Amino acid sequence: MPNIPPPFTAPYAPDDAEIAARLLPASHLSPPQEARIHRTATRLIEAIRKRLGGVEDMLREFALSTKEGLALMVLAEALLRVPDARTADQFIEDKLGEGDFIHHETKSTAFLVNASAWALIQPGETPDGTIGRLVKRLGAPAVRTATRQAMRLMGNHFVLGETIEQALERGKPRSGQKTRYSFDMLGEGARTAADARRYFDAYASAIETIGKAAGNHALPDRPGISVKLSALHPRFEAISRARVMVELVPQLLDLAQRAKAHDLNFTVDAEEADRLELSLDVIAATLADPSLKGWDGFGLAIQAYQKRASAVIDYVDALARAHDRKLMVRLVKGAYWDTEIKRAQERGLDGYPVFTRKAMTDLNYVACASKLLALRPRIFPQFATHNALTVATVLEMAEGSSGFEFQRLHGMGEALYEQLAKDHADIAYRTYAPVGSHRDLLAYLVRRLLENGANSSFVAQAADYRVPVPALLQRPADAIVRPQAAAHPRIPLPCDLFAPERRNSRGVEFGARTALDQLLTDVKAEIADATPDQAHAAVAAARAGFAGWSRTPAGIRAAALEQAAHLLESRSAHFIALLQREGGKTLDDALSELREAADFCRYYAAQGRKLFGSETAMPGPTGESNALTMRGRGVFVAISPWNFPLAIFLGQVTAALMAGNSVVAKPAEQTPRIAREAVALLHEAGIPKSALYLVTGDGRIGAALTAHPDIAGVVFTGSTEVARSINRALAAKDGPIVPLIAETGGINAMIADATALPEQVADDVVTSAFRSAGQRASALRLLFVQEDVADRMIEMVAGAARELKIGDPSDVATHVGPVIDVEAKQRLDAHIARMKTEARLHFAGPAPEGCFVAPHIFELTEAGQLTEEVFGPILHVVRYRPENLERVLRAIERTGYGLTLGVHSRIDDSIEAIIDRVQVGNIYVNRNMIGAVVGVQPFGGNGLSGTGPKAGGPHYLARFATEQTVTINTAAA
Amino acid sequence: IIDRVQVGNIYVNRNMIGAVVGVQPFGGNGLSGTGPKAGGPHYLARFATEQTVTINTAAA
Amino acid sequence: IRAAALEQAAHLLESRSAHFIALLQREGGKTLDDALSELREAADFCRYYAAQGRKLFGSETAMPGPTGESNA
Amino acid sequence: GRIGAALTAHPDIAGVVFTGSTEVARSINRALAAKDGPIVPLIAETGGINAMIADATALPEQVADDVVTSAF
Amino acid sequence: RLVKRLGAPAVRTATRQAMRLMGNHFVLGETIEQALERGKPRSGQKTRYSFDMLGEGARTAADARRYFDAYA
Amino acid sequence: QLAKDHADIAYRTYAPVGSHRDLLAYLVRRLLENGANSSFVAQAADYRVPVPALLQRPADAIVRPQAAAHPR
Ligand SMILES: Cc1cc2c(cc1C)N(C[C@H](O)[C@H](O)[C@H](O)COP(=O)(O)OP(=O)(O)OC[C@H]1O[C@@H](n3cnc4c(N)ncnc43)[C@H](O)[C@@H]1O)c1[nH]c(=O)[nH]c(=O)c1N2
Ligand SMILES: Cc1cc2c(cc1C)N(C[C@H](O)[C@H](O)[C@H](O)COP(=O)(O)OP(=O)(O)OC[C@H]1O[C@@H](n3cnc4c(N)ncnc43)[C@H](O)[C@@H]1O)c1[nH]c(=O)[nH]c(=O)c1N2
Ligand code: PRO
Ligand code: PRO
Ligand code: PRO
Ligand code: PRO
Ligand code: PRO
Ligand code: PRO
Ligand code: PRO
Ligand code: PRO
């Protein structure tokens, strides 16, 4: 036997043009080959257009957005499970579209997780909600018609139940009969340990159901089942690789053995690009087990839209050769394109793991198909596509042989493949039906609706009679023509996300083992207090340096900040090491703060040139010029917290510097070493020694600086109480009234209604409340959840919080590092002890020995029971009745804070009513509440959360400056 | 002189009074007050607070 | 609508300039040039803050950022 | 001024815009800082001891006009 | 051209739909007598619709007589 | 629907009646109104057009007499 291949590690995002330079000349097919492709594909499309309806047909017919399609399909599924069809019909006629629009949308969605939530109207009701807006746009009668069509789609193309047992019973064939379709199991991303067991049992149960109804033919002519690795493990991620290999591989092996005993086709689905390498590790370790010898049905899907696709085929082939197995290997284009684009941008990667032009995916798909056909008979390829051109092209390359199959999803490609079977008798195609429980439908529908609603989609275009048949027949190479056109011209690289305004900081893809190992390796390879006299001397020295720095040209100040950003990223490992050792930060938080620090420098520099680089001409009479400028105020005191000891330290300091002020900077007592390094870096980057001084020490040293009569302002990030005493010490002076800029935390809420996806709420609640041990001013402190989904949401958040690893922040697998010091831990433990006697406990995690606090979840009777910002991993939850959203919003107003607010809801009218009502500075809708990006989410709020202006936004720098008008009577000239 | 002083309104070779709204934004610093200048483009913002709305649109 | 109210206030001030000028002279002690000038300045404040008001509070500023996400 | 003080000391107001003497602006500022509620904005214009510099290249009759206007 | 753009099967479907429209919404014949016979109601029953007579722009004297007779 | 909501409503329905030699000329004109983009029946059947769009009253679309003639 040949060698087991090494762990898969292809380059993540190679250059598109170099890939196109090879694929474009090789795509050339001969004239008679291309003519047959043209004929096959024309006949296939003519059959598609012959005219059972589909999802895309419903979307097209009623001009529905994907949100509206989703709402109607959820309503449809609920209505199908009303015991009496006549009861459902009465509902559709008499109630649907008459009113209770948001109630119907909310109840029908709650039904998917809480079957008892829904059991089945004044006139003139304002049409709101997804359904009400649909009614205003189309009329209630069309909405009824659309809902009835969605009911036919949900009943014909999905195999669903309140439990997997009911789904499998509904999808059963008659005893002695084979199932006419394979099972694409619903289920992705276990959030809890209980989730992972349930999906395992569902899969095992489905394997027995399709096994008992499998016929007597050999492979390939036997049913299949499709499974997702993320469903089988609650932290399926590269940084948790060590536990995944120990925990997931036995689970996947157990299911594969159960599949083998029925001689089934067993397929591991392909998921996001940052899980490719981990999935191949798991798949290799499973396939290696000798219990799977003698069975030809094991396999996996490979996504052609990935630049690594061809290397994955090589890896899978060497795997099959090394263990002397036959594998069934599914080639798809890829279901997560939008996710991959967004992720690479957010993560500042140096490129995209996927192609960005559709024709490039189609080109690579045919090249990969040709590669897979040549690997027969060891590899049995399965070409999963509903594109008539792709099918015609793959068929022509096979040159009329067998040993492969096509694949489709129930409700798509039926006319395509029926016609193919008519014209080529030896054609096999496998049809999968989605099978699973209601609690897994929403997550599945969201992704299915993206492909069916995409404008570039082939099935959507082949069904629009506006698109001529010849348009759907252009071969990919003819659309790309030249390799330099491989990348999409309107999609910038992540490093160009803000061009030409400024550069972007670079991130790291943790799902690329080469990138993660280098980062871990680089990082692994890496103070007397001030007397009141030395602080007093620091002010005097900054005061003397003010005049020259103030008069230094803005472009020179900006150049210094941009060089500071350059040095930060060049020395990223040093600062990351400091953030981990001194700050206690996990590697993602440390990398993220380093990026934020560089982003602050570049953004304030760009803002700085705009604001202080030139004068504004004012209109006015002739013979007179009027020019408005802004100039530095004087000496700013900057006081910074320990929880962002580099980025907030540098944001405040470089803002004051950019506006032309000299700065005395007082860092938190707990984190002076990183502040010392940053100041030394700023001096090296071009900030004169006379313009910036560091003073370390106690709160009494911070007080002496802010009481000093010669300072011109204070920029402060910390607690409400210290901000007030600073404000009082400033107002007590007899000198000028100087600006105070303060950000002082929040008691930040999130509102989740029953239309939100519970697994996304859970993800975002876990992140917002427990990332960085809750040591973020933006962190979620108070979750409001509608009662109809509160049980499932609270239980999923608790199960997810239990899977967070707490420990040493330098370990790659850690999710929750220690809290800053013993005094912090003592404050948090006191609030925990108090809440245990005062409110319901849902989760109290196990904390390791040391300066750790584990995630906690408490449920309150009323929001009023939470009266302080508690700066730790401690979530509070209130469940509420949908009619009481006003009591919720008053509860949020009552705290006096207003920093962040999360809103999880499908309902735009609900989201908007919340935004209109609250004053909160940062509102995050259907995502987590943390990690504001400089120049993207200007960060800061009002009330007890501080003064503004927002850091990282366009109103920040001006507050550090004063205005000057120069009026010159020019008439003498 | 302009480079050296911090005064809010500098009038060269004319009188010092009667600032015109939107022409000479009026106001200064030190013991003369806080800013922003009345009748100028930075005035209104000081009476307001900022709000960022971030919507994950990916579901669409 | 707030801006319209300020512009209508400016319209009314100038339309009733004689009344306010008289008030500025009798109650304020202002000479006629100072009163007229302050009346003009009052109307100018209304129209200027109204125009600034539409620019500043009339619409949202879109922030750059990743695809799949809006920031306003 | 006691009624002005009651208004600026009221715990429900969200800011103060003030034009007058330095001394009163400071006491307003102190009454704001003394509150336990939010730190609210104070916008204050408080006068000046305004100078003029005239050198020997200036036209003395234009300096005179402008000094008389600006001071009286 | 319709076939190249939509495919012959869609053209067949469109033609069958046009056949339903022509049969349901038009009262036609090779002569007016056949149209009127096809558009007749049962003896003793009123026609559920009024007649918008086809016919415009006689080009010939024979045309004008034929349209007169059709109308009559 | 009108007859359902207002019982005293009368409407007359016409059918086209005539011979084949008159169909073409009739169809050409009928097809212009059914195929026109501005047509109400064409827009009320396109679900892309929201119901509120079809309800704008004519005066609100013209606003000013100088806009009566079509600008293009
Ligand atoms: C039986 C079966 C099983 C599966 C899958 C399909 C079927 C039929 N899929 C889904 C598959 O990847 C794909 O999303 C859809 O089938 C649509 O692709 P087509 O070839 O049908 O259509 P079509 O040819 O219209 O191609 C659409 C695809 O093109 C790509 N695309 C669109 N715009 C692009 C752009 N600007 N640049 C680059 N590429 C672009 C996307 O991948 C998109 O899905 C999947 N998917 C997956 O990721 N893992 C899996 O395990 C499976 N499993
Ligand atoms: C029973 C019956 C009998 C007849 C007629 C209709 C019916 C139902 N018609 C046809 C009629 O004049 C009209 O053409 C159609 O009925 C469509 O008009 P609506 O009010 O239905 O539709 P709709 O309200 O959509 O209005 C369409 C009409 O608007 C007008 N229009 C479109 N664009 C315009 C523009 N840019 N500027 C100005 N006007 C514009 C045109 O007149 C066009 O027909 C007719 N017609 C006729 O000329 N003589 C006749 O004897 C008859 N007889
Ligand atoms: O999506 C991922 O890759 C990880 C897995 C658990 C939470 N986020
Ligand atoms: O706001 C801050 O940064 C500090 C740290 C814990 C609570 N207050
Ligand atoms: O052992 C581990 O690594 C994980 C972390 C939390 C629960 N188990
Ligand atoms: O957005 C966040 O999570 C942190 C909190 C203060 C600014 N950045
Ligand atoms: O403090 C402020 O807001 C003023 C306005 C422009 C310059 N600084
Ligand atoms: O410029 C002037 O003379 C007056 C004084 C305050 C503002 N306008
Ligand atoms: O009070 C301020 O200065 C902030 C800046 C932008 C809006 N208001
Ligand atoms: O500044 C003012 O308006 C008052 C008048 C005299 C002293 N201070």
Numbering used by the authors:
A (entry chain A): 1 to 51, 55 to 123, 130 to 535, 542 to 988
B (entry chain B): 929 to 988
C (entry chain B): 571 to 642
D (entry chain B): 714 to 785
E (entry chain A): 142 to 213
F (entry chain A): 428 to 499
Manuscript text:
Proline utilization A (PutA) proteins are bifunctional enzymes that catalyze the oxidation of l-proline to l-glutamate. PutAs contain two spatially separated active sites that catalyze the two reactions of proline catabolism. The proline dehydrogenase (PRODH) active site catalyzes the oxidation of proline to Δ1-pyrroline-5-carboxylate (P5C) with concomitant reduction of the flavin adenine dinucleotide (FAD) cofactor. The intermediate P5C is in equilibrium with its hydrolysis product, l-glutamate-γ-semialdehyde (GSAL). The latter species is the substrate for the GSAL dehydrogenase (GSALDH) active site of PutA, which catalyzes the nicotinamide adenine dinucleotide (NAD+)-dependent oxidation of GSAL to glutamate.
The BjPutA C792A variant was used for X-ray crystallography. Cys792 is the catalytic cysteine of the GSALDH active site, and C792A is devoid of GSALDH activity, but has wild-type PRODH activity. Soaking the crystals in 2 M proline bleached the yellow color, consistent with reduction of the FAD cofactor. X-ray diffraction data were collected on a flash-cooled crystal, and the structure was determined at a 2.15 Å resolution. The asymmetric unit of the C2 crystal form contains a BjPutA dimer. The dimer is a domain-swapped assembly in which the oligomerization domain of one protomer engages the GSALDH module of the other protomer. Although the degree of bending is lower in BjPutA C792A, the direction of bending is the same as in other reduced PutAs. These results confirm the FAD in the BjPutA C792A structure is reduced. Nine proline molecules were modeled into 5 sites. Three of the sites are functionally significant: (1) the GSAL binding site of the GSALDH module; (2) the NAD+ site; and (3) the substrate-channeling tunnel. Accordingly, proline in the GSAL site has the highest occupancy (1.0) and lowest B-factor of all the sites.
